[PDB]
Write a protein that holds these residues in place. Structure first.
Motif, PDB file in Angstrom:
ATOM      1  N   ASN A  36      -2.836   3.857  -3.907  1.00 36.50           N
ATOM      2  CA  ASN A  36      -2.534   2.400  -4.524  1.00 36.50           C
ATOM      3  C   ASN A  36      -3.050   2.330  -5.934  1.00 36.50           C
ATOM      4  OD1 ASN A  36      -5.255   0.984  -5.734  1.00 36.50           O
ATOM      5  ND2 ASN A  36      -5.884   1.076  -4.107  1.00 36.50           N
ATOM      6  N   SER A  64       7.139   3.563  -3.068  1.00 35.06           N
ATOM      7  CA  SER A  64       6.416   2.814  -3.527  1.00 35.06           C
ATOM      8  C   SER A  64       7.059   1.541  -3.301  1.00 35.06           C
ATOM      9  CB  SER A  64       6.174   3.183  -4.911  1.00 35.06           C
ATOM     10  OG  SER A  64       8.235   2.654  -5.132  1.00 35.06           O
ATOM     11  N   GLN A  76       1.524   1.168  -4.253  1.00 30.41           N
ATOM     12  CA  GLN A  76       1.154   1.665  -3.403  1.00 30.41           C
ATOM     13  C   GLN A  76       2.314   3.421  -3.569  1.00 30.41           C
ATOM     14  OE1 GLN A  76      -1.137   1.938  -1.851  1.00 30.41           O
ATOM     15  NE2 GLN A  76      -2.233   3.163   0.214  1.00 30.41           N
TER      16      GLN A  76
END
Length: 82
Positions: A36, A64, A76
């Motif tokens: 993250n 992502s 992420q």
DNA sequence: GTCCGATCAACTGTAGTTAAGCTGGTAAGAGCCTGACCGAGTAGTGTAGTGGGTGACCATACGCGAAACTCAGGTGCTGCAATCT
């Protein structure tokens, strides 16, 4: 060869800067779990402005999505292959 | 709208019903101020969200300078030949 295997181009010509390449290496280490943006920021040792301004150079290599972590809003990152 | 004039009582002559306050000891109206109880009033407050502007960091641009690289200048001998002898 590490440059070429991760980015598709050699260090002699690739457009990704050294700092951004180290960010990519952290995503490479995390693999299927990915990282993250804040744990990435903490592990690399640089601020979220800097991390965000750098990540633009590699957003084509990374899958992502949004997630919420420690009350902050983050994304992420995963290399496409994982 | 007005006209006549009948007619309840207006305004006019005298014959007979109403208070005020005295002796008191007394409870009766009309009352006052502190207190209590809920409704409403004065109004700043409590979360919650939209917008904006500051700050940091970046890269993009030119323009001057710095070193790079290419291509041709320049040094100096002597292998070979020709002027003077």
């Amino acid at each position: 060869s590490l440059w070429t295997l991760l980015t598709g181009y050699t260090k002699k010509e690739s457009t990704i800067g050294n700092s951004a390449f180290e960010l990519l290496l952290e995503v490479a280490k995390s693999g299927e779990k990915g990282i993250n943006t804040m744990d990435l920021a903490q592990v690399t040792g640089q601020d979220p402005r800097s991390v965000t301004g750098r990540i633009k150079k590699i957003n084509h290599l990374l899958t992502s999505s949004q997630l919420i972590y420690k009350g902050h809003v983050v994304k992420q990152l995963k290399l496409k292959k994982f």
